[PDB]
């Protein structure tokens, strides 16, 4: 169990916050929200 999940052609968009990926930009933005949101859970992006 050394290698992760085998795949081809890594998505251009990636969530550099928690650890996600997306094919398009709009998809990534929708996600980033969960991070760029005012809450008392953890460190925000801004
Ligand atoms: Zn994320």
Swiss-Prot record:
Zn fingers (C2H2-type): where? 13-35
Q: Where in the cell is it found?
A: Nucleus
Quaternary structure, from the entry: Interacts with the SLBP/pre-mRNA complex but not with SLBP alone. Interacts with LSM11 in a U7 snRNP-dependent manner.
Please report which protein family the annotation says this sequence is part of: Belongs to the krueppel C2H2-type zinc-finger protein family.
What's its job?
Involved in histone 3'-end pre-mRNA processing by associating with U7 snRNP and interacting with SLBP/pre-mRNA complex. Increases histone 3'-end pre-mRNA processing but has no effect on U7 snRNP levels, when overexpressed. Required for cell cycle progression from G1 to S phases.
Q: What is known of its domains?
A: The C2H2-type zinc finger 2 to 6 are necessary and sufficient for discrete Cajal bodies localization. The C2H2-type zinc finger 5 to 10 are necessary and sufficient for interaction with LSM11. The C2H2-type zinc finger 2 to 8 are necessary for interaction with the SLBP/RNA complex in the histone pre-mRNAs. The C2H2-type zinc finger 2 to 10 confer activity in histone pre-mRNA processing.
Q: What is this protein called?
A: Zinc finger protein 473
Species this chain originates from? Homo sapiens
Print the organism lineage. Answer: Eukaryota, Metazoa, Chordata, Craniata, Vertebrata
């Amino acid at each position: 169990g050394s290698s992760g999940s085998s795949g081809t052609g890594e998505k251009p968009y990636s969530c550099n916050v928690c650890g996600k990926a997306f094919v398009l930009s709009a998809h990534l933005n929708q996600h980033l929200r969960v991070h760029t949101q005012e809450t008392l859970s953890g460190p925000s992006s801004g």
